[PDB]
Amino acid sequence: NVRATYTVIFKNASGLPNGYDNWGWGCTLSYYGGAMIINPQEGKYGAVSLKRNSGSFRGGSLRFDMKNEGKVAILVENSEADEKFEVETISPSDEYVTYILDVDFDLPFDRIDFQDAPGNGDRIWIKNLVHSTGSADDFVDP
Numbered sequence: 001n002v003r004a005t006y007t008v009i010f011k012n013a014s015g016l017p018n019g020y021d022n023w024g025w026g027c028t029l030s031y032y033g034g035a036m037i038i039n040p041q042e043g044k045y046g047a048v049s050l051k052r053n054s055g056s057f058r059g060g061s062l063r064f065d066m067k068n069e070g071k072v073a074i075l076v077e078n079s080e081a082d083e084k085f086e087v088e089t090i091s092p093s094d095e096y097v098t099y100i101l102d103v104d105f106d107l108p109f110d111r112i113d114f115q116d117a118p119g120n121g122d123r124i125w126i127k128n129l130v131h132s133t134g135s136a137d138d139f140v141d142p
C-alpha cells in the first residue's frame with residue numbers, strides 16, 4: 001500500500017486533541033469558533049507544543065489553516081532525543097490560509113510546535129491540523 005496515512009489531529013478544536021498533551025510554554029490557549037487560539041506572552045517567544053502521548057510521526061507533511069497577527073514558526077521535535085527542527089516560518093495573515101508543508105526532518109517526531117517567533121504577543125488561530133506520511137505535492141485534503 002503506497003498511499004499515505006492521514007492523521008486528522010483536529011478539525012474544530014474545543015480543547016486539546018484526544019491523545020495529545022500540551023508541552024507549550026509562554027502562552028495561554030483558548031477555544032472559540034472551532035479554532036485553537038494561542039495568546040503568547042510578550043517577550044516569552046511562546047508556543048503551543050502538541051505532544052503525541054503514544055507514538056510518533058515520520059516525515060511527510062503538515063496541513064493546517066492558520067491566521068496570525070505576526071510571524072509563526074512551525075517546528076517539530078523528537079522528545080526522546082530532545083531534537084528540534086524548523087519546518088517553516090509563516091508571515092502574518094488577517095484571514096485563514098491553508099498551509100501544506102513538507103517535513104524533511106529525518107527522526108520521528110512526537111511534538112508539533114506553533115511559536116510566536118517575534119516574541120511580541122501576536123495571536124495565532126489554528127484549525128484543521130492534519131499530518132500526512134506523504135509529500136505536500138501528493139496531499140489530498142481529508
Ligand SMILES: OC[C@H]1O[C@@H](O[C@H]2[C@H](O)[C@@H](O)[C@H](O[C@H]3[C@H](O)[C@@H](O)[C@H](O[C@H]4[C@H](O)[C@@H](O)[C@H](O[C@H]5[C@H](O)[C@@H](O)[C@H](O[C@H]6[C@H](O)[C@@H](O)[C@@H](O)O[C@@H]6CO)O[C@@H]5CO)O[C@@H]4CO)O[C@@H]3CO)O[C@@H]2CO)[C@H](O)[C@@H](O)[C@@H]1O
Nearest residue numbers: 022023024025044045049075077082084113115117118119
Ligand atoms: O510538563 C510536561 C513535560 O514537560 C517536559 O519538559 C518539556 C517542557 O514541557 C517544554 O515546554 C519544553 O519545551 C522546550 C522546547 O523543547 C524547546 O525547543 C524550546 O526552545 C525555544 C526557546 O525556549 C525559546 O527561547 C527560543 O526562542 C528564540 C527563537 O528561537 C529565536 O528565533 C528568537 O530570535 C530573536 C532574537 O533573539 C532577536 O535578537 C531578534 O533577532 O529576533 C529574533 C526572532 O524574533 O529568539 C528567541 C529567544 O531566544 O525558541 C526555542 C525554539 O522553539 O523551549 C521550550 C521551553 O523550554 O521541553 C521540555 C523538555 O525538554 C518534562 O521533561 C516532562 O517531565 C513533563 O512531563
